[PDB]
Ligand binder design. Structure first.
Ligand code: NA
Lengths: 320, 327
C-alpha cells in the first residue's frame, strides 16, 4: 500500500554505491550510563555536507533520466537541503539553482555556492522562496527537488536503516528526529521490511510538530507556535507520502522541550565530543528526557545524530 | 613476529590479551568510521579511531585501568599516586573510582581549571603543587616515600602499554584488511601497545608515529639510536609534550614502528580545524597529530588506494579554545 518499498531503498543503495559511504555508529559511554541500556549514536552529522540529506538528494538526482538532468534542477532551503542538493549537483554534473531568503546564515550560503549550485537570494521568508521556486519552474522548466516528500528522497534516506541493521543485528529501538518525515519514513521502511520487531520512534520539538500532530490526529494536520533550537525540524505540516508511511510503520512519536534539546546538545559535545546541530540532538533529547525509559532500559537503542551544521559560536551560545 | 616480540620485547601479545580480559564489560570499543574529508584529501580510505570518545575523553583510561586492576589486593590497599596536568590524571582518578582504590593525583598549580575539576569529580584526592612537571614529580616522590603509595606511570610500564594495546585489537576486529595505522607519540605507551597488537596479528601492517616539530624526544631517540631529549618549546599537541621517551617504549618502538614523522603547529591547527568543521568531532591538539601527518603530504607514499587508521587520541580541550581556533 505504501508509496515507497524496500526495493526502492535497495535501488538507492545501488545508486549510492562508491559515492556515499556508511557513517559510524559507536556505543556511547555517557548515554548508555545515563539511560541504563546500550545506546548507539548514528553519525549522520559526519555524512557528506554535514547531514544525512545528501543521501535522498543524491538518489533523486542520480535517478533522473539524461533528459531530465539536462533540464536543470531547483530547490529552496537556507541550510541542509541546500547543501545536499548543491553537492549532488557537482557530483553528477547537473546544473542547479537553490533559492534562499534575502539574508540567510552566511556559513550556509558560501557552503552551497562552494558545492557548485547557483544561489538565488530572494524574499523575507520561506513562503517567498517557494513562490520564487514556482516562478523558476514555470519560466525555466527546472525540476524541483523536494526536501522530504518524494519517493526517491525517502528511499535515499532509508539506506541509513540498512546500515543500522548491517552494524547491529540485535538492535531493539531506533530513535529518529522528524521535520517533514523523509528520514523516519525511509528508515521505517528499511527497518520494518527486514525486522519488524525493531521499534521505530520519532521525536519532535514541543514548539513545532506537524508530523506528531498528524500522527495523534489520524490525518495530515498542521502544528506550529514558534521556532526551535531543532531548526532542521521546524516543519509545520508533514509530507503526504511521509505521513502515509509514518502512520503505518512508526511505533510512537514523542515531544521534547527546548531545554531538553539544549541539554542533549551539551551532553553530545561535552560528554561525547560530537558536534551536533539542534535537530541532530533531538533523538538524544528524548533519551535523556525519561519519556523512552520503558523502551531503552536493558536494551539496545540507536539514536540518529542527523546533522552537525552549526557554528561553534552558536554551540558556545547554547552551552553557556 | 608474535614469537619474536614475545621472546625479545618487554611487552607482548599475551599482555594485551590479559588487558582485554581485565577491561571486558568495563571499557568499551570506540568508533572507527571512514572519513569523507580525509579520504577525499588523501586519495585513499582514511578511518578515524575515536579515543576522544573513550571514558575520560582520551585513551589513557585503558592503560591506567589495566595497571590498577592488575594490582594484588594488598597492593591496592597501599593506595596509588600519579602526577599529570590532564589526561593521565583523569584516567587514574576514574580507574580508582571504578576499582574502589584510594588515589592521590598531583597536578601543577595553573593546570586548566576544567581538567582539575574533572579529576576531582571522579574520586581521587587532588594535590595542587608547583609550576611545572618536575615539581609534581618531586611531590610524587615525597608521597611515595612518606605514604608508601604505588606510583602509576603515564607510559613506561608493561601494564599501561598492554592496556593501550587493546586499541590495536579493536582495529583488527573492525578492519582486518587495514594497511596503515598512524599514531601520535608522547612517551610512546600508546604506539608501543598498538604496535605489539597490530604486528603480532598481521606484521605486514605499517605502524607510523607522529610528533610535533616543537618537541619530539621519541623521534630524536629513534633517529639517533639512544634515548635522547628534545624540546624546542611547547605545542598545541600538549598531550604529546614529552621531551624524553620511556625506556620500555623506546625499545618497542625501535623494533616495531616503521617510521616517525614530524608536523608543524600550523599543520596541527589545520588538522584540528578539519576534524572539527569537516568531521564534526572535538579533538585536542594531540588527537589531531595523526591527521596532521596525513594532510601534510608526509605519508603520501603509503596512503593512496590503501586503508589507513588515524588515532584521534583525545578530545580534552576547552570549547573556548576550540571556538577560538575555529573562529
Ligand atoms: Na624505520
Amino acid at each position: 500500500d505504501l508509496p515507497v518499498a524496500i526495493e526502492d531503498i535497495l535501488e538507492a543503495k545501488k545508486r549510492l554505491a562508491g559515492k556515499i559511504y556508511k557513517t559510524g555508529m559507536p556505543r556511547s559511554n555517557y548515554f548508555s550510563e545515563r539511560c541504563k541500556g546500550e545506546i548507539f549514536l548514528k553519525f549522520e552529522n559526519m555524512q557528506r555536507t554535514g547531514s544525512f540529506k545528501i543521501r535522498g538528494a543524491f538518489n533523486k538526482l542520480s535517478s533522473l533520466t539524461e533528459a531530465e538532468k539536462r533540464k536543470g534542477v531547483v530547490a529552496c532551503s537556507a541550510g541542509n537541503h541546500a547543501q545536499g542538493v548543491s553537492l549532488s549537483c557537482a557530483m553528477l554534473g547537473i546544473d542547479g539553482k537553490v533559492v534562499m531568503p534575502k539574508g540567510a546564515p552566511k556559513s550556509k550560503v558560501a557552503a552551497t555556492c562552494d558545492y557548485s549550485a547557483e544561489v538565488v537570494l530572494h524574499g523575507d521568508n520561506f513562503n517567498d522562496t517557494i513562490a520564487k521556486v514556482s516562478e523558476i519552474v514555470e519560466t525555466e522548466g527546472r525540476i524541483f527537488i523536494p526536501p522530504y516528500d518524494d519517493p526517491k528522497v525517502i528511499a535515499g534516506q532509508g539506506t541509513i536503516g540498512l546500515e543500522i541493521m548491517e552494524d547491529l543485528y540485535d538492535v531493539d529501538n531506533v530513535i529518529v528526529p522528524i521535520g517533514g518525515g523523509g528520514l523516519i519514513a525511509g528508515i521505517a521502511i528499511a527497518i520494518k521490511s527486514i525486522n519488524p520487531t525493531i521499534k521505530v520512534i520519532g521525536v519532535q520539538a514541543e514548539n513545532v510538530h506537524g508530523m506528531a500532530a498528524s500522527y495523534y490526529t489520524g490525518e495530515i494536520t498542521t502544528h506550529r507556535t514558534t521556532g526551535t533550537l531543532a531548526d532542521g525540524c521546524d516543519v509545520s505540516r508533514p509530507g503526504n507520502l511521509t505521513y502515509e508511511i509514518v502512520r503505518e510503520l512508526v511505533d510512537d512519536i514523542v515531544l521534547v522541550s527546548e531545554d531538553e534539546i539544549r541539554n542533549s546538545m551539551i551532553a553530545l559535545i561535552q560528554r561525547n565530543k560530537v558536534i551536533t546541530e539542534g535537530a541532530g540532538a533531538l533523538a538524544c533529547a528524548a533519551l535523556l528526557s525519561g519519556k523512552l525509559d520503558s523502551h531503552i532500559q536493558n536494551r539496545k537503542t540507536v539514536s540518529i545524530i542527523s546533522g552537525g551544521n552549526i557554528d561553534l559560536s552558536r554551540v558556545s551560545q547554547i552551552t553557556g
